[PDB]
């Protein structure tokens, strides 16, 4: 009977919660009590990238830490040269409603997606000087919220149809489909080793997935609202989530618990994007207050702000060498900070 | 450098094209289409000409882009802000849903579901200034229905005879009473006309009215 299984199901949650309590030896704040705070992190706009004529929703650095791509509701996907602020490419999109970007680790491809439920992949290193669309991945029933290349041939995507998928670009078919989320999946972050990935959903729950097997390993429960952003710690052994509750929290996969909550009573708006530093010592978050805060991930003190945007900070990224931070905004400007 | 000089020339060539594309896009009129499954939005779209469906049509030297986002079937709160800045919101409601009920729920009227959606939309924080065009479809079938069935089934309180004019007026006025921003956004209600093709003309007229009012706003002459 349904009641039999439900009463049985809630008993499993009891064991999970009890085990989580038993392993909560000490709060991370206590362990990091003697760590010197990071101090005031005053970062300044070194380059201002102009040319987008609408809101910006997604950006993604390159692996060379010089090139970056950005998408905006104007229907343009622009590859920037951050060093010189000159535009390398301007890719027109078939659908102006784009909510994510991706720069392939090899630099040969970029991807984007949104309300069209398709992940379009573009080839940059062609032999005709132009940038051309390579494949169109059409197997989702809810708008695309995020996407990240694994290789030149594998891309994993999250959608608002409560499922994440893994694709084969050459064949254009889903090698694996990840299901189990009860709400719209907002963002996914790939592990450094490209063996796992976590996804945050509107059901206020984050799940760790296995790319090969296709089954969820862990599910982390936290604050009750749509998780809007998620990113891996650089070691791949943790991740931080940002939701509409105006809170960012740090989960761990090995401990399978929650360590920190980055909340300040003044902040009442929702977090739109999160991203770490090369050392993972700074957790940068782009809120709706028109500003981007910099959090000390090990002390939970707001040390740093990036206030240069007339509108909300949609996206926020760091380089592979951590020499810069770029932030998009609804004000149509990307700013390189350092 | 020479290579750097050529790269800067390329970037300026890109900037010129971006500006031209933006100037071409600014002339376009962006319309958002909402409503229930059977409201008649499909019929309206047919009159005007997966995921998000875009319809492009030109009327009286004005370019309109209509976005039928009813095939999304996900949480609206996550992607509705993407439509901030549209000229208006075309909203469709079927007058022939007063005596019906959704095939899933027990006794929740379809008309009340449309009213719930309309209240959610017109009071949304993203559409404080955005005007709403309200289409009331299936008016002839509604006339046939009301000639035989009573209107009390949906609205418990109703002072009026079972006549099309008064019943339709009551439903319209009930729908126009949901908006609290009475002096910021204007609700333009229209009754669907099939052959006359006056639906696109009404959308045109409402769009020009909002454009002219905004023009008077930003220039201080109002």
């Amino acid at each position, epitope marked *: 009977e349904l009641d039999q299984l439900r009463q049985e199901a809630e008993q499993l949650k009891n064991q999970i919660r009890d085990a989580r309590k038993a392993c909560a030896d000490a709060t991370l704040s206590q362990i990091t009590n003697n760590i010197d705070p990071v101090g005031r992190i005053q970062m300044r706009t070194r380059r201002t990238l102009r040319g987008h004529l609408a809101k910006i929703y997604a950006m993604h650095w390159g692996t060379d830490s010089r090139l970056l791509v950005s998408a905006s509701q104007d229907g343009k996907l622009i590859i920037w040269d951050s060093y010189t602020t000159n535009k390398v490419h301007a890719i027109p999109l078939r659908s102006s409603w784009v909510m994510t970007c991706a720069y392939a680790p090899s630099g040969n491809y970029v991807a984007c997606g949104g309300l069209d439920n398709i992940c379009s992949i573009y080839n940059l290193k062609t*032999r005709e000087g132009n940038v051309r669309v390579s494949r169109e991945l059409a197997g989702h029933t809810g708008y695309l919220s995020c996407c990240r290349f694994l290789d030149d041939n594998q891309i994993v995507t999250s959608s608002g149809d409560t499922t994440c998928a893994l694709w084969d670009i050459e064949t254009g078919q889903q090698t694996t489909t990840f299901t189990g989320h009860t709400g719209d999946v907002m963002s996914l972050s790939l592990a450094p080793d490209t063996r796992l990935f976590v996804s945050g959903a509107c059901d206020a729950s984050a799940k760790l997935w296995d790319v090969r097997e296709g089954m969820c390993r862990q599910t982390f429960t936290g604050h009750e609202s749509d998780i809007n952003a998620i990113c891996f710690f650089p070691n791949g052994n943790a991740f931080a989530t940002g939701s509409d509750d105006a809170t960012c929290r740090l989960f761990d996969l090995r401990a399978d618990q929650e360590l920190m909550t980055y909340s300040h009573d003044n902040i009442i708006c929702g977090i739109t994007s999160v991203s770490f530093s090369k050392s993972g010592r700074l957790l940068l978050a782009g809120y709706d207050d028109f500003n981007c805060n910099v959090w000390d991930a090990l002390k939970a003190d707001r040390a740093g702000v990036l206030a240069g945007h007339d509108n909300r900070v949609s996206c926020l990224g760091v380089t592979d060498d951590g020499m810069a931070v770029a932030t998009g905004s609804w004000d149509s400007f990307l700013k390189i900070w350092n | 450098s020479a290579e750097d000089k050529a*790269a800067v*020339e390329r970037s300026k060539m890109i900037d010129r094209n971006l500006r031209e594309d933006g100037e071409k896009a600014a002339r376009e009129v962006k319309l958002l289409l909402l409503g229930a499954g059977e409201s008649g939005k499909s019929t309206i779209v047919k009159q005007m000409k997966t995921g998000i469906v875009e319809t492009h049509f030109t009327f009286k030297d004005l370019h309109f882009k209509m976005f039928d986002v009813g095939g999304q079937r996900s949480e609206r709160k996550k992607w509705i802000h993407c439509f901030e800045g549209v000229t208006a919101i075309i909203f469709c409601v079927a007058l022939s849903d007063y005596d019906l009920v959704l095939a899933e729920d027990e006794e929740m009227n379809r008309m009340h579901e449309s009213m719930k959606l309309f209240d959610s939309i017109c009071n949304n924080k993203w559409f404080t200034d955005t005007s709403i065009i309200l289409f009331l479809n299936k008016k002839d079938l509604f006339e046939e229905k009301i000639k035989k069935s009573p209107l009390t089934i949906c609205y418990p309180e109703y002072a009026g005879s079972n006549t099309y004019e008064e019943a339709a007026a009551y439903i319209q006025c009930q729908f126009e009473d949901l908006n609290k921003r009475k002096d910021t956004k204007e609700i333009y209600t229209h009754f669907t006309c099939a052959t006359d093709t006056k639906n696109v003309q009404f959308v045109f007229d409402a769009v020009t009215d909002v454009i002219i009012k905004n023009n008077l706003k930003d220039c201080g002459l109002f």
Partner: single-chain antibody
Amino acid sequence: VQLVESGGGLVQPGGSRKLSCSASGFAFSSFGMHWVRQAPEKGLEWVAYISSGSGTIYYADTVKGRFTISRDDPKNTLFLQMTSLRSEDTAMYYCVRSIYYYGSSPFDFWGQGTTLTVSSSDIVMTQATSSVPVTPGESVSISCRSSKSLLHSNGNTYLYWFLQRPGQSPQLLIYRMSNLASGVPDRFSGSGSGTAFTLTISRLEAEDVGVYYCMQHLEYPLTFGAGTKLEL
């Protein structure tokens, strides 16, 4: 992605002839086009250039004011107007395409060229080696010298390499020191610093025999070097 040039032939001194190259198979409008000429028995020599959009036109000192270069993007064609041809203008005129953006490979595709026979402060690149004997398989190194530091402040060493097989157009191998072009075997490799440059081949074959050229791009007029033929 072919490039074909037209014109040439026999012209008496003092006449004016027009050279045209019709591009096909790529986005011509976003490519900067060059013209390079080769004497009947001597090396290459740059003459002209247009940038993308016709916004920058340069010429060689020996044709300045005499030649006129123009492009017609809608038809994907490149033109060269020549006036009062001198006896020193006998050469086969190549057309080269190039695109400049971060990471691109300029001078990557060369046309077949046309033959023209007239009846009758600049960096110098020097490579005094010619007809070096060699054998398929062995390791051979080609040396080049410059009179100026080609290493720019931004960190790019604008020294290129080309290979002209017998009866074929020049083919790019290395678009900048320590970089390899697309579609060329991995055997070719070149390293250098400052003004001393080298091109190394691990194992070669009968296919890669020919004359090797060196070109710099630090500043115009893109002076070439003398040929370096591999003997076989």
